[PDB]
Design a protein around this nucleic acid. Structure first.
Ligand code: MG
Ligand code: MG
Ligand code: MG
Ligand code: MG
Ligand code: MG
Ligand code: MG
Ligand code: MG
Ligand code: MG
Ligand code: MG
Ligand code: MG
Ligand code: MG
Ligand code: MG
Ligand code: MG
Ligand code: MG
Ligand code: MG
Ligand code: MG
Ligand code: MG
Ligand code: MG
Ligand code: MG
Ligand code: MG
Ligand code: MG
Ligand code: MG
Ligand code: MG
Ligand code: MG
Ligand code: MG
Ligand code: MG
Ligand code: MG
Ligand code: MG
Ligand code: MG
Ligand code: MG
Ligand code: MG
Ligand code: MG
Ligand code: MG
Ligand code: MG
Ligand code: MG
Ligand code: MG
Ligand code: MG
Ligand code: MG
Ligand code: MG
Ligand code: MG
Ligand code: MG
Ligand code: MG
Ligand code: MG
Ligand code: MG
Ligand code: MG
Ligand code: MG
Ligand code: MG
Ligand code: MG
Ligand code: MG
Ligand code: MG
Ligand code: MG
Ligand code: MG
Ligand code: MG
Ligand code: MG
Ligand code: MG
Ligand code: MG
Ligand code: MG
Ligand code: MG
Ligand code: MG
Ligand code: MG
Ligand code: MG
Ligand code: MG
Ligand code: MG
Ligand code: MG
Ligand code: MG
Ligand code: MG
Ligand code: MG
Ligand code: MG
Ligand code: MG
Ligand code: MG
Ligand code: MG
Ligand code: MG
Ligand code: ZN
Lengths: 204, 37, 140, 16, 174
RNA sequence: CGCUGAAAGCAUCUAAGCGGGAAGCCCGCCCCAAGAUGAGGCCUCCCACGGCAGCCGGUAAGGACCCGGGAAGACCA
RNA sequence: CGAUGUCGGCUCGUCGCAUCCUGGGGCUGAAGAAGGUCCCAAGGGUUGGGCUGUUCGCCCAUUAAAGCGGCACGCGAGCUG
């Protein structure tokens, strides 16, 4: 089950067969495997992947030990791809070909303390006809004496976004090995310059 | 299948079966098939 | 003359083979062993029962049609969050829990009853990792 | 849905 | 008025080895094991198997008759063998043998493929008749049923898949 | 809805056994999660310093404070 | 009764199933298509508008369907009045 780490760079649209396709560019390769997890040693199967070069000054001592055991230059982020064993010591964009269908994980844009209307799409209150300082309020949150409490899970205001979101089954439009570029069709979670993970889709 | 609390034989060809905790009635006559409930 | 109060004594480890035993009938005896009520210097306000290793929990036995009809029950606090798990399935997914849940319910509730449940160590399969305590193999 | 209208049992509260 | 007591004639050369809660039967066509309640006793005599029951309570009376027939169907199984025939009725409706497999064309958009499970052999003599043959009784009947279900007798026409010897009962339309 | 099948010489989906069968159930998908006090696992770094399962002082790996900020954000994080 | 705010609407739902639809079935006076009738099933879904304070109902135009009920006839320290 192949995967790769990357950065969201920006969107555009290209032309393919008199059709405009919205795309998102992701800079994916190259990612050196710096640990492998096995059923003996760890209980399961994964490949720990590294991404983006780091100023070795900024990498502390417990971390320096970890890279050296891999034969690997210091790296900004570590992330695993589960149930994955590439034969090489380095994973690149060459593992996805145009037409392939992928899933991408990103960290969503953060809307901070979000109101009930933005977060959960409540209807708010009326805007005239006597509506009184409730125009964006949630309304009732319960019943009366029975049950006489509020359910767990009840949708209310609170922080929104800045959370892990996966969007699935996106079409791979192109790959440009010469630039470690990956062109996926559609929209990817997070802001430009954001970290993402690209896996083979779990969709049939 | 008829479902009712009173299951009786309808014709002389009906047979009373008890099957998996339930009283049934089977027969060659497709109407007459019954189960209690 | 005031009643005897023991000084803290060393708890005996004990081994039980659950294979083929009746679920609840094994349970009462493990509970008794856990309270320590088989000890003449029993004291209700201190943990002084035995430790109990149990093996072969997966091959415990139960009477009647409870295989399909004993439902274990769990509520999450969310609306509609009462899940229902038949006995069969519990054996097939976390077998050691059938014995644990049975024993748990037979120990007193409160802080002491919860620590005695800890003193019970239940395993499915023929083996356990408790060699270091060299548990005395009891019949029950 | 109760078919017979039920009387109010408290007045609309006033400053009184 | 009693089945379990009736002795089972065993044609030579087949063998009946008794075992705790099972019995084994080998013959010219193969072997089979018959699961048998520890309460019943299976007895190997000369060219004969008999079964006896521990008492006259209902359950023993019920396991008795079953155990004989179960064993007896195993006996006949590995010597004479079992078979059931299926007649295919209706115009477009035909059959053919695809490799070892059974090809059914009975008026869907597609043909039907039935695979022979282990211990089953399909025979296609004519386009409109098919034979299921094997040493297991309970298995031959299951398969035939499985094949029949693919296109059961119309209630209004002589059309579909029938058992050999299945009476044609139809209702009037209009 | 069956297969095989007694009791009950026949019949029976059942009493022994075996099939097929739902947008429903269990899993699978996405998110949270070891305060899971039952507090898990792996990789890697530190070291057995002084004075009197303890206290006190200085340190190690490391961390915090402070500062420039940030599609992170009420403060906090 | 030294106070348990009362219809309807809005808002937010959650539950029951005696199921309106969608799924699985038996019987049919089931040719096909389409219905009738009972059984299983609460996962999801179950529209917009005219009249009236209305709930309900009637009507217009659609619909797979335009389900019925409980939660102080849910919900006024949430709004309307
Ligand atoms: Mg991320
Ligand atoms: Mg709002
Ligand atoms: Mg939103
Ligand atoms: Mg909106
Ligand atoms: Mg609105
Ligand atoms: Mg309004
Ligand atoms: Mg608005
Ligand atoms: Mg006002
Ligand atoms: Mg005002
Ligand atoms: Mg205003
Ligand atoms: Mg109220
Ligand atoms: Mg209130
Ligand atoms: Mg309450
Ligand atoms: Mg946040
Ligand atoms: Mg192209
Ligand atoms: Mg952006
Ligand atoms: Mg009569
Ligand atoms: Mg009959
Ligand atoms: Mg004892
Ligand atoms: Mg006491
Ligand atoms: Mg387990
Ligand atoms: Mg208790
Ligand atoms: Mg108490
Ligand atoms: Mg012989
Ligand atoms: Mg004798
Ligand atoms: Mg007609
Ligand atoms: Mg039949
Ligand atoms: Mg039969
Ligand atoms: Mg009779
Ligand atoms: Mg049975
Ligand atoms: Mg089955
Ligand atoms: Mg079944
Ligand atoms: Mg079938
Ligand atoms: Mg679906
Ligand atoms: Mg996580
Ligand atoms: Mg922890
Ligand atoms: Mg965690
Ligand atoms: Mg717990
Ligand atoms: Mg830990
Ligand atoms: Mg700031
Ligand atoms: Mg009053
Ligand atoms: Mg007062
Ligand atoms: Mg008062
Ligand atoms: Mg008052
Ligand atoms: Mg008051
Ligand atoms: Mg119902
Ligand atoms: Mg239907
Ligand atoms: Mg029809
Ligand atoms: Mg017609
Ligand atoms: Mg019908
Ligand atoms: Mg019915
Ligand atoms: Mg029925
Ligand atoms: Mg439902
Ligand atoms: Mg629900
Ligand atoms: Mg509903
Ligand atoms: Mg108007
Ligand atoms: Mg109106
Ligand atoms: Mg109206
Ligand atoms: Mg008006
Ligand atoms: Mg009216
Ligand atoms: Mg319709
Ligand atoms: Mg309407
Ligand atoms: Mg409701
Ligand atoms: Mg109500
Ligand atoms: Mg009310
Ligand atoms: Mg109210
Ligand atoms: Mg008010
Ligand atoms: Mg009101
Ligand atoms: Mg109030
Ligand atoms: Mg109040
Ligand atoms: Mg409000
Ligand atoms: Mg007024
Ligand atoms: Zn009849």
């Amino acid at each position: 089950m192949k995967g790769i780490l990357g950065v969201k760079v920006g969107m555009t649209r290209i032309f393919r067969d008199d059709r405009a396709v919205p795309v998102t560019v992701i800079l994916a390769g190259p990612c050196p495997v710096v640990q492998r997890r096995t059923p003996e040693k760890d209980g399961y199967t994964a490949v720990q992947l590294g991404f983006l070069p780091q100023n070795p000054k900024r990498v502390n001592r417990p971390l320096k030990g970890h890279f050296a055991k891999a034969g690997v230059e210091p790296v900004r982020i570590l992330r695993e791809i589960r149930d994955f064993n590439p034969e090489g010591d380095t994973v690149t964009v060459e593992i996805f070909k145009p037409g392939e269908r992928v899933d991408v994980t990103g960290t969503s844009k953060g809307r901070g303390f979000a109101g009930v209307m933005k977060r959960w799409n409540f209807a708010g209150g009326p805007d005239s006809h006597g509506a009184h300082k409730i125009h964006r309020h949630p309304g009732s949150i319960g019943n009366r004496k029975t049950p006489g409490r509020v359910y767990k899970g009840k949708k209310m205001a609170g922080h929104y976004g800045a959370e892990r979101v996966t969007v699935m089954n996106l079409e791979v439009v192109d790959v440009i090995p010469e630039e470690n570029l990956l062109l996926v069709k559609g929209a990817v979670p997070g802001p430009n310059g954001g970290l993402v993970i690209v896996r083979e889709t779990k969709k049939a | 299948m008829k479902v009712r609390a009173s299951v009786k034989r309808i014709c002389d060809k009906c047979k009373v079966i008890r099957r998996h905790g339930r009283v049934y009635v089977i027969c060659e006559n497709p109407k007459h098939k019954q189960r209690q409930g | 003359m005031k009643t005897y109060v023991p000084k803290q004594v060393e708890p005996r480890w004990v081994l039980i083979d659950a294979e083929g035993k009746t679920l609840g009938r094994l349970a009462t005896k493990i509970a008794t062993l856990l309270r320590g009520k088989h000890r003449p210097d029993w004291t209700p306000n201190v943990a002084m029962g035995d430790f109990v290793v149990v093996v072969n929990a997966d091959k415990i036995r139960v009477t009647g049609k409870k295989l399909e009809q004993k439902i274990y029950t769990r509520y999450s606090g969310y609306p509609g969050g009462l899940k229902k798990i038949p006995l069969e399935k519990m054996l097939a997914t976390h077998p050691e829990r059938v014995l644990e849940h049975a024993v748990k319910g037979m120990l007193p509730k409160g802080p002491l009853g919860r620590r005695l449940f800890k003193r019970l160590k239940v395993y499915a399969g023929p083996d356990h990792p408790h060699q270091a305590q060299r548990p005395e193999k009891l019949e029950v | 849905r109760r078919i017979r209208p039920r009387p109010p049992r408290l007045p609309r509260p006033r400053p009184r | 008025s009693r089945i379990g007591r009736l002795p089972i004639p065993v044609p030579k050369g087949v063998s009946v080895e008794v075992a705790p809660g099972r019995v084994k039967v080998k013959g010219p066509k193969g072997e089979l094991e018959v699961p048998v309640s520890p309460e019943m006793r299976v007895v190997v005599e000369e060219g004969v198997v008999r079964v006896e029951r521990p008492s006259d309570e209902r359950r023993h009376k019920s396991l008795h008759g079953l155990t004989r027939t179960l064993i007896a169907n195993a006996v006949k199984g590995v010597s004479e063998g079992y078979s059931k025939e299926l007649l295919i009725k209706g115009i477009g409706y035909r059959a053919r043998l695809v490799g070892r497999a059974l090809e059914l064309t009975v008026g869907f958009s597609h043909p039907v493929v039935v695979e022979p499970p282990e211990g089953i052999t399909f025979e296609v003599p004519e386009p409109t008749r098919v034979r299921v043959s094997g040493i297991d009784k309970q298995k031959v009947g299951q398969v035939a049923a499985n094949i029949r279900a693919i296109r059961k007798p119309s209630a209004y026409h002589e059309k579909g898949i029938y058992y050999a010897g299945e009476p044609v009962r139809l209702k009037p339309g209009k």
